[PDB]
Design a protein around this nucleic acid. Structure first.
Lengths: 118, 233
RNA sequence: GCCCUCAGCCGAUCGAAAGGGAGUCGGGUUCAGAUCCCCGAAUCCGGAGUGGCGGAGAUGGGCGCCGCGAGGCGUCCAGUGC
RNA sequence: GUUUUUUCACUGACCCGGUGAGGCGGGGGGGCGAGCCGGGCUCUCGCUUCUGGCGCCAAGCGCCCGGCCGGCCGGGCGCGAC
């Protein structure tokens, strides 16, 4: 075994894996963006009721940290119903308002009665 | 048998022709700072005029005496740490149902009992780190009459005793099975360590260059040899 | 996991809502929003573990043994397109 | 010896430039040449100018080491940089 390049670079050296002796906090910190926290109250103005019968969609209010991806399963796993798309924005008073399109086999005035918004 | 297809195809590594090979480059490498120091804290001990008292540590015992002197000390080792569990335990078997000759480790046990007038032969190790622990000691074994000798390996002194290093290891007792072979080694040590000790005192180390000027000065000495040669005859 | 080689960098990181920088355009709709809504036409990057189907690589040359001939049988070298 | 000091010299502090810190110092081995009768002494050299091409990741030669039934198939340590 012999020299070849005129530099000296630091050799490689083994590194173990961590293997702690006590697990630092006693239990994993719990998740507080349930399905329940994420969906607040349905919105029921003149202009939301124009977006139910006509389009076939709903209008919700939603924890401002919420994703679209997150929201879409929470409308899925409490009223049972499958979604097409979930548009969002954020109001000048400062809360998240998600416009929830629905499927053709499903119906919009009909599910709206089940929950209470009419 | 052979194939006419194959062709030998040389390279010509002469200047400006064919990209140079891969090769031996030790001698030009940029080394790290921690090495580049240690390799030139041994060059300032040939140039520099090492004075005579620290200069006697290069003076060391040779090969046929160094492998012979660790076979008499092989019979007078200290016991192992596992031996102290069947000796301390061996008292409670005989009761509930004059030390044999051994070494003296450390400088603070050797320097007192060489002047106390007990020991026979004293040993030293060469590579003693901060040197000022053993600068005084060889001139103190000079006067009293306790012949000193230096072995290359402070590591392998403190492998008699179970530790990592040592410095000095003295004898005060030897058995009547070995009273000739301990009286023998003291004569092969004393006549060239505490008879020529005086010789030792004069002998300064240093003022000896690195070759890169031996062979330019020597070069020009012969320059004042051919002018005196062709002139005369 | 470990080992053998193989590896020039060149300096972490920040700095442009008028520099650089793939790909959306028409007709309609509201008191107040639209290249973002809805009808309809298009298409850019990622992804494919059983890679879902077509096509392309790829389909040829020369002798023998039967057959009026088209083809049928073995046996031996070509084919990373024109 | 011990100093009193004038010069010319040295390299090991200590300063500056250069680079991916890539061939610098001593000897040996061959080519071109200088002089004494196959022999050494004193050296000069160590291969690349015609063109607005191409050049890397060893061929060639020795010496061992394991797989299938003399041939078939796959690794180690050297030459080149003495």
């Amino acid at each position: 075994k012999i020299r070849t390049s005129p530099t000296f670079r630091r050799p490689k050296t083994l590194r173990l894996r961590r293997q702690p002796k006590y697990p630092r906090k006693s239990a994993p910190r719990r998740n507080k963006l349930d399905h329940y926290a994420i969906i607040k109250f349905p919105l029921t103005t003149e202009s939301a009721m124009k977006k139910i019968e006509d389009n076939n969609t709903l209008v919700f209010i939603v924890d401002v940290k919420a994703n679209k991806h997150q929201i879409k399963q929470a409308v899925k796993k409490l009223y049972d119903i499958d979604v097409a798309k979930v548009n969002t924005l954020i109001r000048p008073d400062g809360e998240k308002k998600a416009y929830v399109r629905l499927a053709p086999d499903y119906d919009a005035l009909d599910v709206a009665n089940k929950i209470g918004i009419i | 048998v052979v194939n006419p297809l194959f062709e030998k195809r040389p390279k010509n590594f002469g200047i400006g022709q064919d990209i140079q090979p891969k090769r031996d480059l030790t001698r030009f490498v940029k080394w790290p700072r921690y090495i580049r120091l240690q390799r030139q804290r041994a060059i300032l001990y040939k140039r520099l005029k090492v004075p005579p008292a620290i200069n006697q540590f290069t003076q060391v015992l040779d090969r046929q005496t160094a492998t012979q002197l660790l076979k008499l000390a092989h019979k007078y080792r200290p016991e192992t740490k596992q031996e102290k569990k069947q000796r301390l335990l061996a008292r409670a078997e005989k009761k509930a149902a004059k030390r044999p000759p051994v070494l003296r480790a450390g400088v603070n046990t050797v320097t007192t009992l060489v002047e106390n007038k007990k020991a026979q032969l004293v040993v030293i190790a060469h590579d003693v780190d901060p040197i000022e622990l053993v600068v005084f000691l060889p001139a103190l074994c000079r006067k009293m009459g306790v012949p000193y000798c230096i072995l290359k390996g402070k590591a392998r002194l403190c492998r008699l005793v179970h530790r990592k290093t040592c410095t000095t290891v003295a004898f005060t007792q030897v058995n009547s099975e070995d009273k000739g072979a301990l009286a023998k080694l003291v004569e092969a040590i004393r006549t060239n360590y505490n008879d020529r000790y005086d010789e030792i005192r004069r002998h300064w180390g240093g003022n000896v260059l690195g070759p890169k000027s031996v062979a330019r000065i020597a070069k020009l000495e012969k320059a004042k040899a051919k002018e005196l040669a062709t002139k005369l005859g």
